[PDB]
Amino acid sequence: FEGGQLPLFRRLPKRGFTNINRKEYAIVNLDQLNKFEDGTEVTPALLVESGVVKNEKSGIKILGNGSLDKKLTVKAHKFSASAAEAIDAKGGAHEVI
Amino acid sequence: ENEDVNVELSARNIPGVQVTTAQGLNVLDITNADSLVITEAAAKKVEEVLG
Amino acid sequence: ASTGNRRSHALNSTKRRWNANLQKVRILVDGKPKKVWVSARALKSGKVTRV
Amino acid sequence: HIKKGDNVKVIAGKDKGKEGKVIATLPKKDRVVVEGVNIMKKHQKPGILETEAAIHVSNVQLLDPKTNEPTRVGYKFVDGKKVRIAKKSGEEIK
RNA sequence: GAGCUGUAAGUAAGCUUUGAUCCAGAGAUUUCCGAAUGGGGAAACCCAGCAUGAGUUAUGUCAUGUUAUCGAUAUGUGAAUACAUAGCAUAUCAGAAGGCACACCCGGAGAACUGAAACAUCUUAGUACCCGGAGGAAGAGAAAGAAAAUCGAUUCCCUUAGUAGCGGCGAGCGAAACGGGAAGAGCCCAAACCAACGUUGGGGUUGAGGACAGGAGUUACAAAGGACGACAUUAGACGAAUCAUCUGGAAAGAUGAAUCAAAGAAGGUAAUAAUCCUGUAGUCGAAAAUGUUGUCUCUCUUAUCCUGAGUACGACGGAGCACGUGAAAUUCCGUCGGAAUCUGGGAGGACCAUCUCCUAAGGCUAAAUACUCUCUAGUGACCGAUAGUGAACAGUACCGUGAGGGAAAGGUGAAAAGCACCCCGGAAGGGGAGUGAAAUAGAACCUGAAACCGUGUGCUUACAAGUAGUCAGAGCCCGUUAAUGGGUGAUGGCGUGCCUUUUGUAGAAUGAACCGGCGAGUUACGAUUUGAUGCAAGGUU
RNA sequence: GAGGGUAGCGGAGAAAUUCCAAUCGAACCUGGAGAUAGCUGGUUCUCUCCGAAAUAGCUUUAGGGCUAGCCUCAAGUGAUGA
RNA sequence: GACAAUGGUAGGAGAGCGUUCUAAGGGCGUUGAAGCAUGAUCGUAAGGACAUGUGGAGCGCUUAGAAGUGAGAAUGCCGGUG
RNA sequence: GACUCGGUGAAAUCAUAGUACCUGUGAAGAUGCAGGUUACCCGCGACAGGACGGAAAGACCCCGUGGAGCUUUACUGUAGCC
Ligand SMILES: [K+]
Ligand SMILES: [K+]
Ligand SMILES: [Mg+2]
Ligand SMILES: [Mg+2]
Ligand SMILES: [Mg+2]
Ligand SMILES: [Mg+2]
Ligand SMILES: [Mg+2]
Ligand SMILES: [Mg+2]
Ligand SMILES: [Mg+2]
Ligand SMILES: [Mg+2]
Ligand SMILES: [Mg+2]
Ligand SMILES: [Mg+2]
Ligand SMILES: [Mg+2]
Ligand SMILES: [Mg+2]
Ligand SMILES: [Mg+2]
Ligand SMILES: [Mg+2]
Ligand SMILES: [Mg+2]
Ligand SMILES: [Mg+2]
Ligand SMILES: [Mg+2]
Ligand SMILES: [Mg+2]
Ligand SMILES: [Mg+2]
Ligand SMILES: [Mg+2]
Ligand SMILES: [Mg+2]
Ligand SMILES: [Mg+2]
Ligand SMILES: [Mg+2]
Ligand SMILES: [Mg+2]
Ligand SMILES: [Mg+2]
Ligand SMILES: [Mg+2]
Ligand SMILES: [Mg+2]
Ligand SMILES: [Mg+2]
Ligand SMILES: [Mg+2]
Ligand SMILES: [Mg+2]
Ligand SMILES: [Mg+2]
Ligand SMILES: [Mg+2]
Ligand SMILES: [Mg+2]
Ligand SMILES: [Mg+2]
Ligand SMILES: [Mg+2]
Ligand SMILES: [Mg+2]
Ligand SMILES: [Mg+2]
Ligand SMILES: [Mg+2]
Ligand SMILES: [Mg+2]
Ligand SMILES: [Mg+2]
Ligand SMILES: [Mg+2]
Ligand SMILES: [Mg+2]
Ligand SMILES: [Mg+2]
Ligand SMILES: [Mg+2]
Ligand SMILES: [Mg+2]
Ligand SMILES: [Mg+2]
Ligand SMILES: [Mg+2]
Ligand SMILES: [Mg+2]
Ligand SMILES: [Mg+2]
Ligand SMILES: [Mg+2]
Ligand SMILES: [Mg+2]
Ligand SMILES: [Mg+2]
Ligand SMILES: [Mg+2]
Ligand SMILES: [Mg+2]
Ligand SMILES: [Mg+2]
Ligand SMILES: [Mg+2]
Ligand SMILES: [Mg+2]
Ligand SMILES: [Mg+2]
Ligand SMILES: [Mg+2]
Ligand SMILES: [Mg+2]
Ligand SMILES: [Mg+2]
Ligand SMILES: [Mg+2]
Ligand SMILES: [Mg+2]
Ligand SMILES: [Mg+2]
Ligand SMILES: [Mg+2]
Ligand SMILES: [Mg+2]
Ligand SMILES: [Mg+2]
Ligand SMILES: [Mg+2]
Ligand SMILES: [Mg+2]
């Protein structure tokens, strides 16, 4: 309350809407995939069991932060472009599930 | 180690003496006591449960 | 009869009732002809026959 | 457990150590009147009456028939009857 | 298992081991009013009828039963009016009435102060009050569901989440599904269709089914009973172990030496007791009644047609849904209209098509859940007599026409041993003498503060102008927690209380007669921040 | 005089805002209820350190409020202060 | 040891006193507890002891925990007494 | 009635009071401050100039986004009626 001066959240406009079907992904960066041994097959079950992902949400997405120094096979719902490039560059493979 | 009925009955009426199981260990009871008298099996169970 | 609201153009609320369209006719209740208050919708339905 | 006519020892109070017969029993108040015990001097209007005043039943104790030592009294059954028996010896109390 | 005739002293008269008082189970009695019901009535009263019985020559009087209204059954009788019906009389039943803790529950009806810094939409709030109906719970409940990979009645807890949304898009209001749990149970009809004389039986009960072609039970699913046993409840019984000395009025305290413990909970006893008492741990116990219960028993069973019609649904007006008519689906009410019939119908948030899920317009159903006037057993870093109930001795006294409002008031002592007797006094009240450990514990009774009221007097005071003290200071009187002491104070300097509120108060602004007691930032749930601590790409339920 | 009737969103009034149980521009009692009170009053032990403001802007605002200004506490930063 | 600082309302910060209750430890008390009264006592304050009288059965201390935790004012409430 | 004596015996009020005047000062009208002036201690009967004397949280006046009663071609409703 501003004593009768029009309050701040009335002098400002409303903006936007909320998407009912908003999809939010659990995100794993490259630096978090470095805890697995070479040749590992990474899967949402393995990421959940290892403590990398607590809540899976709409699916797992791999992002490109950090350095990946281990060859892996990754099965995730989504990959960022740099994530795919750095997974394949290090000799590994990735699949979309 | 477990609920020993005869030990509990024999020690119940002695003032200053308290009886508990390994599972029932709590900080008030241990802190109040001046000494702990624990069986071998109870000691092993305590070591197992509390790591 | 059910209660509800009469609403003004400014949406001022005033309690009001909805009365049944009762009509006094003779319907032969329990074998004996008898003039009773009966709703016109009930007369349309056909459960109660006059005279 | 203390009855009229009993021989009792006074184990607490001014007359501790004295023995006497239980003259009266006041079970509602848990007091007994013991002859020669707790003598009061009352001012009679129409002299000075000197008579026993009751004392609490827990201040008297029965004497064992055999050792003549104070004893708590238990209870036993003999042919469908409850009989007082001394703890110290076990002999039945009169 | 020896006292007893309530509280509750006092006698008097009695009862009681030939078993009382007392406790529990069951019986008997149970005036009058009150729904109050034979009629009336200003409740606890008045006045009757009928039948039966006492009494009286007889009347008066009395005793007992019966007589309300509305319902229910069944025998007559009788209108307007011919049959009939309405109605009327009689017998039989004893169904309703009224009350409450009516706290929780369901329904009808339904505010306002208030918030929005005004106010009308909105909010308070479907709250308060009123009314109706019940139960030990109620309500809900067996998908025309949730959903979108499938689940499988209802309810309730956690969470989702103060999210989605609603909203003079203000103040505010505010879900649900998924997931985790408590509990867990499913069933009966209507219809087609058969048997019989439209009404009864058979049959059937759904997401495609139906028509046609031993195991289950009185907690729903049909409903009444017995036999025996069990347990528990409503009285009770047993139940270990201490002596001495000291101080004391009294020992349980101190001291010394012992004991018991499945019992060192607690209360009492002349001060503070495991061993003195009542008890405690533990064990035992029911003539009778009441339950809950198990077994036996006892019961019952072995796509041709149909599928809820004045219905669904629609318009208008409203309401309930978190949702204010809005893109408003979904549910209900009034008025008016008004379908389809498995190629059917409904929902998936306007609506259409596909797809998916379901199968309305009949009913029943335990448990998980809500509450406490109560009862039984217990508990408390809850009160301790201005507190804690209004009430420790009261819905009383008192106030009011009434509805209604509503106090104050606890403590002798261990034991009444409650002051024989003498003296003054009419008495009241005292002084002695006694009781008692104590009487300045004597009933107006534990302790007994302060205000306030008195008696005695060490210093001081009748030439003095004042918020009463303070600093300096002789004189006089005392002598301590022994301190460069205490009381008083001639005389001198300085000096307009306190609180509140104010620019500013000695203020002639506010408040307080004095003394005492009581009397005001608390708690819950959220948010944020700081300190502390644990763990750490994890932390935590 | 007696016995009755009219009741508060109401009665009654040869009318005065007049009476309705000793104050009637809307009786009394209880409940909502601790209504609301931007107003007045009150708010209880001690010491230690620091120490304001009575201004601006906006305000159905003017003895109220909000942000800024001025106080304090704690971490930073370090020439930026006088 | 040697330099500085220490008036203060609203208000911010810090440290303490005392009350009742609880836990643990250790104590006191009929050879007299709490309460009350008096005193020339101690501490920087809130406040703490001791001695004597009264009183007649409970009460301190230490550490920690919790609050119905502190009154002089409210035309405050109740009582008592001017 | 008042007044004196015997009996009985309230009240409003009240921060504590050993409570002078003048001129001044001061929240601008002083028992209480300054400077002077005046005044032995304690009653009783009287009078009302002051204690801005007592009584009632000013009825006037203003203020509160207070209330209530009343009015109307204020706004929005509504009983009723057509
Ligand atoms: K005793
Ligand atoms: K004034
Ligand atoms: Mg009656
Ligand atoms: Mg009658
Ligand atoms: Mg009657
Ligand atoms: Mg009947
Ligand atoms: Mg009946
Ligand atoms: Mg009832
Ligand atoms: Mg009821
Ligand atoms: Mg408002
Ligand atoms: Mg009701
Ligand atoms: Mg009811
Ligand atoms: Mg026994
Ligand atoms: Mg014993
Ligand atoms: Mg002894
Ligand atoms: Mg159907
Ligand atoms: Mg609605
Ligand atoms: Mg709806
Ligand atoms: Mg809608
Ligand atoms: Mg529909
Ligand atoms: Mg008291
Ligand atoms: Mg009381
Ligand atoms: Mg005397
Ligand atoms: Mg005398
Ligand atoms: Mg005497
Ligand atoms: Mg005497
Ligand atoms: Mg005394
Ligand atoms: Mg006294
Ligand atoms: Mg002179
Ligand atoms: Mg002189
Ligand atoms: Mg003077
Ligand atoms: Mg002076
Ligand atoms: Mg000021
Ligand atoms: Mg002024
Ligand atoms: Mg003053
Ligand atoms: Mg004055
Ligand atoms: Mg004022
Ligand atoms: Mg005053
Ligand atoms: Mg006071
Ligand atoms: Mg607050
Ligand atoms: Mg009335
Ligand atoms: Mg008149
Ligand atoms: Mg008038
Ligand atoms: Mg006029
Ligand atoms: Mg009047
Ligand atoms: Mg309210
Ligand atoms: Mg109020
Ligand atoms: Mg300073
Ligand atoms: Mg100004
Ligand atoms: Mg404006
Ligand atoms: Mg200072
Ligand atoms: Mg200074
Ligand atoms: Mg502070
Ligand atoms: Mg502190
Ligand atoms: Mg303290
Ligand atoms: Mg105490
Ligand atoms: Mg307090
Ligand atoms: Mg006061
Ligand atoms: Mg007085
Ligand atoms: Mg005269
Ligand atoms: Mg006189
Ligand atoms: Mg001044
Ligand atoms: Mg001047
Ligand atoms: Mg003057
Ligand atoms: Mg002067
Ligand atoms: Mg005079
Ligand atoms: Mg005068
Ligand atoms: Mg005046
Ligand atoms: Mg005023
Ligand atoms: Mg006024
Ligand atoms: Mg004036």
mmCIF file of N, CA and C (backbone and C1' of nucleotides) in Angstrom, chain E residues 455-477:
data_model
loop_
_atom_site.group_PDB
_atom_site.id
_atom_site.type_symbol
_atom_site.label_atom_id
_atom_site.label_comp_id
_atom_site.label_asym_id
_atom_site.label_seq_id
_atom_site.Cartn_x
_atom_site.Cartn_y
_atom_site.Cartn_z
ATOM 1 P P U E 455 -2.272 8.837 72.189
ATOM 2 O "O5'" U E 455 -1.339 8.000 73.160
ATOM 3 C "C5'" U E 455 -1.892 7.249 74.226
ATOM 4 C "C4'" U E 455 -0.854 6.351 74.832
ATOM 5 C "C3'" U E 455 0.490 7.002 75.112
ATOM 6 O "O3'" U E 455 0.502 7.732 76.324
ATOM 7 C "C1'" U E 455 0.829 4.952 74.000
ATOM 8 P P G E 456 1.486 8.984 76.509
ATOM 9 O "O5'" G E 456 2.933 8.333 76.623
ATOM 10 C "C5'" G E 456 3.307 7.561 77.752
ATOM 11 C "C4'" G E 456 4.711 7.027 77.610
ATOM 12 C "C3'" G E 456 5.787 8.055 77.295
ATOM 13 O "O3'" G E 456 6.245 8.737 78.446
ATOM 14 C "C1'" G E 456 6.028 6.194 75.864
ATOM 15 P P U E 457 6.826 10.226 78.320
ATOM 16 O "O5'" U E 457 8.201 10.040 77.539
ATOM 17 C "C5'" U E 457 9.258 9.245 78.068
ATOM 18 C "C4'" U E 457 10.383 9.093 77.073
ATOM 19 C "C3'" U E 457 11.129 10.388 76.746
ATOM 20 O "O3'" U E 457 12.496 10.092 76.467
ATOM 21 C "C1'" U E 457 10.205 9.505 74.774
ATOM 22 P P G E 458 13.660 10.687 77.394
ATOM 23 O "O5'" G E 458 14.790 11.136 76.364
ATOM 24 C "C5'" G E 458 16.128 10.671 76.481
ATOM 25 C "C4'" G E 458 16.871 10.764 75.167
ATOM 26 C "C3'" G E 458 16.894 12.134 74.502
ATOM 27 O "O3'" G E 458 17.917 12.973 75.010
ATOM 28 C "C1'" G E 458 16.264 10.502 72.916
ATOM 29 P P C E 459 17.673 14.551 75.174
ATOM 30 O "O5'" C E 459 17.735 15.114 73.686
ATOM 31 C "C5'" C E 459 18.954 15.138 72.960
ATOM 32 C "C4'" C E 459 18.732 15.510 71.518
ATOM 33 C "C3'" C E 459 18.021 16.829 71.265
ATOM 34 O "O3'" C E 459 18.865 17.960 71.378
ATOM 35 C "C1'" C E 459 17.049 15.156 69.927
ATOM 36 P P U E 460 18.274 19.374 71.860
ATOM 37 O "O5'" U E 460 17.247 19.787 70.716
ATOM 38 C "C5'" U E 460 17.686 20.090 69.401
ATOM 39 C "C4'" U E 460 16.522 20.241 68.456
ATOM 40 C "C3'" U E 460 15.561 21.375 68.763
ATOM 41 O "O3'" U E 460 16.032 22.624 68.296
ATOM 42 C "C1'" U E 460 14.341 19.409 68.279
ATOM 43 P P U E 461 15.692 23.974 69.090
ATOM 44 O "O5'" U E 461 14.225 24.356 68.607
ATOM 45 C "C5'" U E 461 13.963 24.719 67.262
ATOM 46 C "C4'" U E 461 12.481 24.762 66.993
ATOM 47 C "C3'" U E 461 11.665 25.645 67.922
ATOM 48 O "O3'" U E 461 11.717 27.013 67.564
ATOM 49 C "C1'" U E 461 10.606 23.547 67.697
ATOM 50 P P A E 462 11.477 28.154 68.666
ATOM 51 O "O5'" A E 462 9.909 28.427 68.624
ATOM 52 C "C5'" A E 462 9.291 29.057 67.510
ATOM 53 C "C4'" A E 462 8.009 29.750 67.908
ATOM 54 C "C3'" A E 462 8.143 30.909 68.885
ATOM 55 O "O3'" A E 462 8.433 32.116 68.212
ATOM 56 C "C1'" A E 462 6.314 29.501 69.498
ATOM 57 P P C E 463 9.835 32.863 68.386
ATOM 58 O "O5'" C E 463 9.869 33.833 67.130
ATOM 59 C "C5'" C E 463 9.741 33.332 65.802
ATOM 60 C "C4'" C E 463 10.489 34.198 64.818
ATOM 61 C "C3'" C E 463 11.848 34.691 65.310
ATOM 62 O "O3'" C E 463 12.737 34.823 64.204
ATOM 63 C "C1'" C E 463 10.466 36.542 64.843
ATOM 64 P P A E 464 13.767 33.657 63.827
ATOM 65 O "O5'" A E 464 12.921 32.676 62.904
ATOM 66 C "C5'" A E 464 12.560 33.051 61.588
ATOM 67 C "C4'" A E 464 11.360 32.287 61.101
ATOM 68 C "C3'" A E 464 10.884 32.659 59.707
ATOM 69 O "O3'" A E 464 11.565 31.904 58.724
ATOM 70 C "C1'" A E 464 9.049 32.635 61.221
ATOM 71 P P A E 465 12.092 32.581 57.372
ATOM 72 O "O5'" A E 465 10.854 32.455 56.387
ATOM 73 C "C5'" A E 465 10.119 31.244 56.275
ATOM 74 C "C4'" A E 465 9.342 31.195 54.984
ATOM 75 C "C3'" A E 465 10.040 31.842 53.784
ATOM 76 O "O3'" A E 465 9.743 31.104 52.601
ATOM 77 C "C1'" A E 465 7.942 32.849 54.112
ATOM 78 P P G E 466 10.793 31.039 51.389
ATOM 79 O "O5'" G E 466 10.753 29.516 50.933
ATOM 80 C "C5'" G E 466 11.547 28.534 51.592
ATOM 81 C "C4'" G E 466 10.771 27.272 51.893
ATOM 82 C "C3'" G E 466 9.807 26.800 50.801
ATOM 83 O "O3'" G E 466 9.802 25.375 50.750
ATOM 84 C "C1'" G E 466 8.629 27.113 52.821
ATOM 85 P P U E 467 10.998 24.582 50.035
ATOM 86 O "O5'" U E 467 10.345 23.197 49.615
ATOM 87 C "C5'" U E 467 9.352 23.113 48.606
ATOM 88 C "C4'" U E 467 9.350 21.738 47.992
ATOM 89 C "C3'" U E 467 10.417 21.479 46.924
ATOM 90 O "O3'" U E 467 10.835 20.117 47.019
ATOM 91 C "C1'" U E 467 8.288 21.056 46.030
ATOM 92 P P A E 468 12.374 19.723 47.255
ATOM 93 O "O5'" A E 468 12.535 19.705 48.832
ATOM 94 C "C5'" A E 468 11.777 18.801 49.625
ATOM 95 C "C4'" A E 468 11.971 19.052 51.096
ATOM 96 C "C3'" A E 468 11.435 17.959 52.013
ATOM 97 O "O3'" A E 468 12.251 17.886 53.179
ATOM 98 C "C1'" A E 468 10.308 19.988 52.460
ATOM 99 P P G E 469 12.367 16.521 54.015
ATOM 100 O "O5'" G E 469 13.251 15.567 53.100
ATOM 101 C "C5'" G E 469 14.651 15.753 52.980
ATOM 102 C "C4'" G E 469 15.052 15.904 51.540
ATOM 103 C "C3'" G E 469 16.545 16.057 51.287
ATOM 104 O "O3'" G E 469 17.194 14.803 51.173
ATOM 105 C "C1'" G E 469 15.374 17.780 50.175
ATOM 106 P P U E 470 18.547 14.487 51.975
ATOM 107 O "O5'" U E 470 19.680 15.218 51.133
ATOM 108 C "C5'" U E 470 19.886 14.935 49.759
ATOM 109 C "C4'" U E 470 20.625 16.066 49.097
ATOM 110 C "C3'" U E 470 21.883 16.515 49.821
ATOM 111 O "O3'" U E 470 23.011 15.744 49.463
ATOM 112 C "C1'" U E 470 20.547 18.397 49.324
ATOM 113 P P C E 471 24.009 15.198 50.589
ATOM 114 O "O5'" C E 471 25.062 16.375 50.764
ATOM 115 C "C5'" C E 471 25.903 16.755 49.690
ATOM 116 C "C4'" C E 471 26.460 18.142 49.880
ATOM 117 C "C3'" C E 471 27.046 18.458 51.243
ATOM 118 O "O3'" C E 471 28.325 17.901 51.470
ATOM 119 C "C1'" C E 471 25.687 20.246 50.561
ATOM 120 P P A E 472 28.804 17.576 52.968
ATOM 121 O "O5'" A E 472 28.967 19.006 53.651
ATOM 122 C "C5'" A E 472 29.952 19.927 53.207
ATOM 123 C "C4'" A E 472 29.833 21.263 53.898
ATOM 124 C "C3'" A E 472 29.892 21.248 55.413
ATOM 125 O "O3'" A E 472 31.197 21.097 55.928
ATOM 126 C "C1'" A E 472 28.148 22.663 54.724
ATOM 127 P P G E 473 31.423 20.228 57.252
ATOM 128 O "O5'" G E 473 30.565 20.972 58.373
ATOM 129 C "C5'" G E 473 30.907 22.275 58.830
ATOM 130 C "C4'" G E 473 29.903 22.807 59.825
ATOM 131 C "C3'" G E 473 29.721 21.984 61.091
ATOM 132 O "O3'" G E 473 30.685 22.314 62.069
ATOM 133 C "C1'" G E 473 27.603 22.534 60.183
ATOM 134 P P A E 474 31.589 21.182 62.747
ATOM 135 O "O5'" A E 474 31.727 21.668 64.255
ATOM 136 C "C5'" A E 474 30.774 21.295 65.242
ATOM 137 C "C4'" A E 474 30.147 22.501 65.893
ATOM 138 C "C3'" A E 474 29.515 22.261 67.253
ATOM 139 O "O3'" A E 474 30.459 22.300 68.307
ATOM 140 C "C1'" A E 474 28.007 23.461 65.886
ATOM 141 P P G E 475 30.519 21.109 69.378
ATOM 142 O "O5'" G E 475 29.096 21.158 70.089
ATOM 143 C "C5'" G E 475 28.718 22.256 70.905
ATOM 144 C "C4'" G E 475 27.265 22.172 71.297
ATOM 145 C "C3'" G E 475 26.819 20.861 71.925
ATOM 146 O "O3'" G E 475 27.132 20.764 73.303
ATOM 147 C "C1'" G E 475 25.293 21.475 70.238
ATOM 148 P P C E 476 27.681 19.383 73.912
ATOM 149 O "O5'" C E 476 26.373 18.503 74.111
ATOM 150 C "C5'" C E 476 25.276 18.986 74.866
ATOM 151 C "C4'" C E 476 24.002 18.268 74.508
ATOM 152 C "C3'" C E 476 24.018 16.755 74.660
ATOM 153 O "O3'" C E 476 23.821 16.331 75.998
ATOM 154 C "C1'" C E 476 23.066 17.327 72.579
ATOM 155 P P C E 477 24.483 14.968 76.532
ATOM 156 O "O5'" C E 477 23.661 13.812 75.804
ATOM 157 C "C5'" C E 477 22.258 13.685 75.982
ATOM 158 C "C4'" C E 477 21.674 12.604 75.105
ATOM 159 C "C3'" C E 477 22.380 11.259 75.145
ATOM 160 O "O3'" C E 477 22.009 10.479 76.264
ATOM 161 C "C1'" C E 477 21.947 11.859 72.899
#
